[PDB]
Design an enzyme around this catalytic site. Structure first.
Site, PDB file in Angstrom:
ATOM      1  CG  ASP A  86      -2.218   0.791   0.919  1.00  0.00           C
ATOM      2  OD1 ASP A  86      -2.534   1.037  -0.268  1.00  0.00           O
ATOM      3  OD2 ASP A  86      -2.876   1.196   1.894  1.00  0.00           O
ATOM      4  CB  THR A  93      -6.009   4.317  -5.954  1.00  0.00           C
ATOM      5  CG  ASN A 151      -0.414   4.021   3.089  1.00  0.00           C
ATOM      6  OD1 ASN A 151      -1.382   4.737   2.828  1.00  0.00           O
ATOM      7  ND2 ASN A 151      -0.501   2.698   3.162  1.00  0.00           N
TER       8      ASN A 151
END
Length: 335
Positions: free
Chosen positions: A148, A185, A153
């Site tokens: 991720d 995404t 993040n």
């Protein structure tokens, strides 16, 4: 400093085993999403000790079928002991919510800083990328994939050092195995994820290239008006992208070496592993030893007045939502 460190960590575990939710006061909100919220909390008995408490609605986890992802997030983040990964000290739970007591990093969200500045300069991006590289070295040495990676993040502590947050999609994977979940995404999916071929640790290396590009430009390299065009652009490859002039020669070389189509060809996966990334010419003159010792001066120095200063974060209204339904499924038995 292994024995000293082990003693410190054991003492921390014993310290946190004894705490209850009523031992904390809420100071301010640090973030709000669909999962829930992150609240800065203060230990009542030691007001210099503050933490980021992530509070998640259990029913929303069930609805999205994220139970395994959340359990993996707890296991991986609570077991990780890295200066480039936000500590998860312990969890709590009741019938409606999970509570994750995390290290408070008050330098601010990297995504809001990137938003305010538009883009980061080359040396700034290099420092942040090195932080990510150290985190990845730790996790991959433990057989963990992060998946991720993106500006949202990463978070800065009061010094300006960047640390990975959000391990919802992190996963331990066996040698010679793959995993298949499409996370993130469309701008961030590696080709093997788009083509439903399964993925492993090598996808992280792809994401690292993406992150550099985004930090240098404010936008990831593959982006279309719609998700399908985005995936077609990704399949077209990093070598077919028109790099803007601001990206330095060596940065473009490293981005291309991380974003190769074949997972086995990506930098970090070759014979010398992560060393091939760290020894890349882009990191020529970068003091990795000083970064791991904390002596390297960060590119953006946050101003943090106290353990309760939330001024490096956007302002958020207080939680006024209808409480979710109880969830007694027992999948949160370890929390």
């Amino acid at each position: 400093e292994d024995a000293e460190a082990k003693a410190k960590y054991e003492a921390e575990a014993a310290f946190f085993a004894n705490l209850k939710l009523s031992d904390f006061n809420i100071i301010d909100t640090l973030g709000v999403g669909g999962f829930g919220r992150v609240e800065l909390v203060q230990l009542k008995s030691e007001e210099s000790k503050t933490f980021a408490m992530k509070i998640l609605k259990k029913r929303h986890i069930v609805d999205t079928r994220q139970q395994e992802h959340i359990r993996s997030e707890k296991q991986i983040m609570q077991g990780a002991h890295s200066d480039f990964i936000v500590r998860l000290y312990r969890t709590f739970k009741d019938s409606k919510y999970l509570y994750m007591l995390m290290e408070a990093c008050l330098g601010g969200e990297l995504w809001t800083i990137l938003r305010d500045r538009g883009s980061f300069e080359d040396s700034t991006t290099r420092f942040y990328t090195a932080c990510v590289v150290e985190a990845f070295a730790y996790l991959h040495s433990k057989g963990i994939i992060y998946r991720d990676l993106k500006p949202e993040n990463l978070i800065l502590d009061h010094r300006g050092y960047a640390k990975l947050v959000d391990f919802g999609f992190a996963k331990k994977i066996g040698f010679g195995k793959k995993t298949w979940t499409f996370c993130g995404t469309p701008e961030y999916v590696a080709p093997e994820i788009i083509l439903n071929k399964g993925h492993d640790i090598s996808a992280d290396y792809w994401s690292l290239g993406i992150l550099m590009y985004e930090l240098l430009t404010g936008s990831p390299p593959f982006s279309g008006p719609d998700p399908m065009k985005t995936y077609n652009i990704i399949l077209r490859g990093i070598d077919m992208i028109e790099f803007p002039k601001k990206i330095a020669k060596n940065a473009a070389n490293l981005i291309k070496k991380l974003c190769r189509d074949n997972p086995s060809e990506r930098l970090g996966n070759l014979k010398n592993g992560v060393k091939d990334i760290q020894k890349h010419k882009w990191f020529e003159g970068f003091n990795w030893e000083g970064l791991r010792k904390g002596t390297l001066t960060p590119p953006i120095i946050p101003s943090v007045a106290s353990p309760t200063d939330t001024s490096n974060f956007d302002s958020f209204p207080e939680d006024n939502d209808e409480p979710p339904p109880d969830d007694n499924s027992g999948w949160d038995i370890d929390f």
